[PDB]
Write a protein that binds this DNA or RNA. Structure first.
Lengths: 128, 262, 58, 59, 59
RNA sequence: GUUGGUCGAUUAAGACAGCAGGACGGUGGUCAUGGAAGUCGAAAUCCGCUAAGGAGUGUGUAACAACUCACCUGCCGAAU
């Protein structure tokens, strides 16, 4: 599985479905129709990481804020934080209000256990 | 964890952790988490956790004597028949009764293909139908006792047959080919080897839920009462209709064997 | 009947069906003892082959 | 058997069969030792079964 | 048994089985003494029971 | 190589070798952006369940993965 990426509402894109294979492993613009309606959520913005699931002669990703999609999008910053925990490059500090709701939807899509686990969260696979 | 190294992975301190939970709860249950993978294990554990929670333990776990000594019970090395501990196994403490816990795990088991070098927990069987594989090493199927033939240029299973018997090890080739077919022959979770609950050692015959056999014994016992009730002449509650029919047999006997009109 | 089953267990164990043995079993069940009935049944059932009777009945 | 008879007596007398009150008591009164492991299984059938169906059946 | 024969026979004639008249009398003719406690139970049985259903049924 | 020493560790609460098992979830709330739960790459470091399973040694699906070993068990019975 070779993933593939999407920006909101696109279909059939040559730059994304030709050099990265036409997903399903044949049949480009099968993924393209399904993805467009699915991943039109927040604004198209910076490119969304979507990670591919394959079905019987259909390619489709269900994006329903799966952790991977959210990653670049949430801060809304076009550069990066790079070498973090010391001197962040941008000043895009996401608020607590956005953080809790974004985190919660991941925590039903990632095989997550505890409700109380969201307290324990963060440090290594986040801020670091 | 962050203490990645060999340095302390505490002994006597974590022995006390195991001790406290044992003293708290009526039931200490030992079930084999060896069979289960970690991702799979969490799903089984989640249901059990609501009742009262589970903790997994090392060789401090087998030291059940000290745990028992702190409270008063008898589920240790001596008084329990054998500590049944296996690799990556914990002790599962639950509020749920011995019959209920058996049901809880059994209802929610998660499928997984069988694993190499482990003895197959059940028979593994192959269905008829196309394998889904392209023409390749058709020889590999035949060794395992998966019958195959080339029809339409593709490998297809001609008939169902049992690939391997219970108690026989799963091949490297066997595990791979079963997974491709989509066969997940055993469904995995915490197989319960023994349960200790409320001063009693319960073996798996208690846990099961056959019966049907025990219904037959009930009917047999009642039949012995009914037969006795006929002869005796004793107009107690059950025996009062039955005794009357004994007297009727004498009247009936002459009429049927003869042809005598009364 | 409580009395009939009380007799039946004694036969299985190989311990004789007499007034003393049958009466105590009835008490254990938690049904009250009524004076004539355990003694009367024990006397009556004595010298009967229960085994052949079980296997008959038509 | 010993075990079948113990709860059979309880049902006929009209008493319920719990562990300590009746089920253990009946077999012990005969002078046979009741096994703690086995007895719970025997008790379990009475629970959640319509026992009059079994009573009706002869074997 | 002794006891079964006496009360059953009385039913055929349509007679009740009371103590002295019929119930003991049948055994006495044979030379057999009926037990007083057992006799009481036979007398009680016919009273308050619908006898006709028992007779009708075959076994 | 073999010898006796010295200073620390770990060890009958069963360690250390070797099999056999497990080596996951919080987690791709985040950055290389085409991308990387650890993994073509980089500053980083603690929990859940814990006895365990590195926010990572490699094998690798340009993704996941399981696999390996480092971490601990079952086996093991005395040192390492």
């Amino acid at each position: 599985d070779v993933f593939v990426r999407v920006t909101g509402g696109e279909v059939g894109a040559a730059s994304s479905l030709a050099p990265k294979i036409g997903p399903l492993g044949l049949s480009p613009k099968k993924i393209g129709e399904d993805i467009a309606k699915e991943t039109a959520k927040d604004w198209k913005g910076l490119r969304v990481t979507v990670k591919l699931t394959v079905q019987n002669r259909q390619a489709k990703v269900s994006v329903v804020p799966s952790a991977a999609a959210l990653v670049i999008k949430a801060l809304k910053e076009p550069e990066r934080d790079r070498k973090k925990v010391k001197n962040i490059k941008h000043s895009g500090n996401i608020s607590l209000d956005d953080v809790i709701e974004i985190a919660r939807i991941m925590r039903n899509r990632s095989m997550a256990k505890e409700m109380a686990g969201t307290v324990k969260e963060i440090l290594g696979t986040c801020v670091s | 964890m962050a203490i990645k190294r060999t340095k302390a992975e505490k002994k006597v301190a974590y022995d006390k952790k195991l001790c406290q939970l044992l003293d708290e709860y009526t039931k200490v249950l030992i079930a084999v988490a060896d069979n289960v993978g970690s991702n799979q294990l969490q799903e089984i554990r989640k249901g059990l956790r609501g009742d009262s929670i589970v903790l997994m333990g090392k060789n401090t776990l087998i030291r059940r004597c000290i745990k028992v000594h702190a409270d008063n019970t008898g589920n240790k090395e001596f008084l329990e028949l054998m500590p049944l501990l296996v690799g990556n196994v914990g002790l599962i403490f639950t509020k749920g009764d011995l019959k209920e816990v058996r049901e809880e795990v059994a209802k929610y088991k998660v499928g997984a293909p069988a694993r190499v070098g482990l003895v197959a927990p059940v028979d593994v069987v192959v269905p008829p139908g196309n394998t889904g594989l392209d023409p390749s090493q058709t020889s590999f199927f035949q060794v395992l006792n998966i019958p195959t033939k080339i029809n339409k240029g593709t490998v297809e299973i001609i008939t169902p047959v049992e690939l391997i018997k219970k108690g026989d090890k799963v091949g490297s080739s066997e595990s791979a080919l079963l997974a491709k077919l989509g066969i997940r022959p055993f469904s995995y979770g915490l197989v319960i080897t023994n349960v200790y609950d409320s001063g009693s050692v319960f073996s798996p015959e208690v846990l099961d839920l056959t019966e049907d056999d025990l219904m037959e014994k009930f009917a047999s016992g009642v039949s012995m009462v009914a037969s006795v009730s006929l002869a005796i002449s004793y107009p107690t509650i059950a025996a009062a209709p039955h005794m009357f029919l004994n007297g009727y047999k004498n009247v009936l006997a002459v009429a049927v064997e003869t042809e005598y009109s009364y | 009947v409580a009395c009939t089953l009380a007799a039946l267990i004694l036969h299985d164990d190989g311990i004789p069906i007499t007034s003393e043995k049958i009466a105590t079993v009835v008490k254990a069940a938690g049904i009250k003892v009524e004076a004539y009935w355990p003694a009367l049944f024990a006397k009556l059932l004595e010298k009967r082959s229960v085994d052949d009777l079980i296997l008959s009945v038509g | 058997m010993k075990f079948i008879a113990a709860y059979l007596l309880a049902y006929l007398s009209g008493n319920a069969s719990p562990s300590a009150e009746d089920l253990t008591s009946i077999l012990e009164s005969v002078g046979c030792e009741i096994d703690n492991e086995k007895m719970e299984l025997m008790l379990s059938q009475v629970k959640g079964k319509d026992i009059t169906e079994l009573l009706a059946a002869g074997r």
